């Protein structure tokens, strides 16, 4: 906690999250451009929010070039400012505003490769993100992309215990969560990234459900309805119903037609039904899909 608010100059508002406003700001002494996340505590009658406690405590430990860096925490008696490194855009905005003819394959490879690095680092540090979606992935001018918004993250134990249910924004939520799994693990973050991989190729959400059951149904129509063969346990799960329609799995080359063989292989492994068979971030880094990525590793921040 070396900072004080007097050394920052607010430049403009750049967003609004779970605690409210995020500003872009400039350190008047060092020149450094940062994002200030403000969290008002006078409006809080339960004291410091658990979202903030988790976000701060977990991000202090996660120093990685593909995780947005928490630089400082200014703790006044009435307000709490998180100072973050500044990144000018998120993946959703990039996809909408600039990727109308599409994101070139090189850039998709690079982005997905960096995301897997960031995620592996989280999992290696017993942290689940639990809200991976394009809005929460920040890009800079240098071609880096970084995991952000750790407000829904959680420090896990090994083996995992039961955590909060129905986490993850719906479109990016894994089937084990939708089926009311007693336990979920690292595989839920992989599911989200798989959804994001598909979305970078098409510029549209892979499974845009309007409800938990609609979401499952969308998934089942694309990947087939799971049975005991593809997913031992599935039919015993708390929210599994034998009445579920039994849809045939489609050729994966139909799911994302413009994807090459390596891409489809990797995508299929990210979206495996069985959480136990779904690929880890660590193993995904070695997939042949990445054989041709050359973009140099972003340097760590201080």
């Amino acid at each position: 906690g070396p900072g004080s608010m007097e050394n920052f100059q607010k430049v403009e508002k750049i967003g609004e999250g779970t605690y409210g406003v995020v500003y872009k700001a400039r350190n008047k002494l060092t020149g450094e451009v940062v994002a200030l996340k403000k969290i008002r505590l006078d409006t809080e009658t339960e004291g410091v929010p658990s979202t903030a406690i988790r976000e701060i405590s977990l991000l202090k430990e996660l120093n990685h070039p593909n995780i947005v860096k928490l630089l400082d925490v200014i703790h006044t008696e009435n307000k709490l400012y998180l100072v973050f490194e500044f990144l000018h855009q998120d993946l959703k905005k990039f996809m909408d505003a600039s990727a109308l003819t599409g994101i070139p394959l090189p850039l998709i490879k690079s982005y997905l490769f960096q995301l897997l690095q960031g995620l592996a680092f989280c999992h290696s540090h017993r942290v689940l993100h639990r809200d991976l979606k394009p809005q929460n992935l920040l890009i800079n001018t240098e071609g880096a992309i970084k995991l952000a918004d750790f407000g829904l993250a959680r420090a896990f134990g090994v083996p995992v215990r039961t955590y909060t249910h129905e986490v993850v924004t719906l479109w990016y939520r894994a089937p084990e969560i939708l089926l009311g799994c007693k336990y979920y693990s690292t595989a839920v973050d992989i599911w989200s990234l798989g959804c994001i991989f598909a979305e970078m190729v098409t510029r549209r959400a892979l499974f845009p459900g309007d409800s938990e059951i609609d979401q499952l149904f969308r998934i089942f129509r694309t990947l087939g309805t799971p049975d005991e063969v593809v997913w031992p346990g599935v039919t015993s799960m708390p929210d599994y119903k034998p009445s579920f329609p039994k849809w045939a799995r489609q050729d994966f080359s139909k799911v994302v037609p413009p994807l090459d063989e390596d891409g489809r292989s990797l995508l299929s492994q990210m979206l495996h039904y069985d959480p136990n068979k779904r690929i880890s971030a660590k193993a995904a880094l070695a997939h042949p899909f990445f054989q041709d990525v050359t973009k140099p590793v972003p340097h760590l921040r201080l």
């Binding site: 004291g47 405590s57 017993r126 690292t186 660590k282």
Partner: protein
């Protein structure tokens, strides 16, 4: 399977080992506390054990709170009248970190029998956060235990529950457990439980994982064994009462072994 994170458990173990060293309280802080004693702390921890069972909190939550308390008392002198306020704020923070449904602040005020106000609890919350610099993701005995449990052939719930019990007992007594890292008390606890229930010992597979042997564990083992033997006599009984419950397989009713044979 993936709930045991095969691809990450070893990375995670290594990281926890590094962090327990960073998150370690000062061994000799109680002597430097003019107004508080091991016995006062034992009273506080036992009360927090009861608060956990009253509110059906995770054991993990209880362990975090103690970690927070001991780190706080390593740098901040506290008058006896304020010890419970530190402990209350610690349990609040631990609940916000670890629980799905943490109790509301008003319940933490309530359990202190209106000794402190809501404003006091919330100001102590802030101070604890300042003192710890929000380093709340501390390794506990439980985080190590659950991993060590994966080395039983085969799994045995009495063993698991007994280890957890012995680990909790150690939270009560700064002398001598402040001297030991979570990973080491967990090792001793696991070995003692396993020996008590099955006759078996610290597996070689855990020697591979941890680098600890019965030789390295011996000091801790001798303390935990005495603690277990004396436990019916100890002034604080809330953990034994808790572990009489069927949820913990009634393990506090098991008989400790008279000897460890090396």
């Amino acid at each position: 399977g993936v709930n045991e994170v095969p691809d990450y458990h070893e990375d995670i173990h290594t990281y926890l080992r590094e962090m327990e060293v960073k998150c370690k309280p000062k061994v000799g802080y109680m002597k430097k506390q003019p107004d508080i004693t091991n016995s006062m702390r034992a009273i506080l921890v036992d009360w927090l054990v009861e608060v956990g069972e009253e509110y059906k909190l995770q054991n993990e939550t209880l362990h975090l709170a103690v970690n927070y308390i001991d780190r706080f008392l390593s740098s901040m002198s506290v008058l006896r009248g304020k010890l419970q306020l530190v402990g209350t704020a610690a349990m609040l923070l631990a609940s916000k970190f670890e629980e799905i449904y943490p109790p509301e602040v008003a319940e933490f005020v309530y359990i202190t029998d209106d000794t402190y106000t809501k404003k006091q609890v919330l100001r102590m919350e802030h101070l604890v956060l300042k003192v710890l610099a929000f380093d709340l993701a501390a390794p506990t005995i439980n985080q190590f235990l659950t991993q060590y449990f994966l080395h039983q052939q085969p799994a045995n719930c009495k063993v698991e529950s007994l280890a957890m019990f012995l680990g909790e007992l150690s939270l009560i007594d700064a002398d001598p457990y402040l001297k030991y890292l979570p990973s080491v008390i967990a090792a001793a606890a696991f070995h003692l439980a396993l020996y008590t229930v099955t006759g078996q010992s610290w597996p070689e597979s855990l020697v591979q994982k941890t680098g600890y042997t019965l030789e390295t564990l011996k000091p801790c083992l001798l303390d935990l064994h005495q603690t277990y033997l004396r436990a019916p006599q100890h002034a604080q009984q809330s953990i034994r009462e808790k572990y009489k419950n069927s949820k913990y397989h009634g393990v506090s009713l098991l008989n400790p072994p008279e000897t460890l044979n090396v």
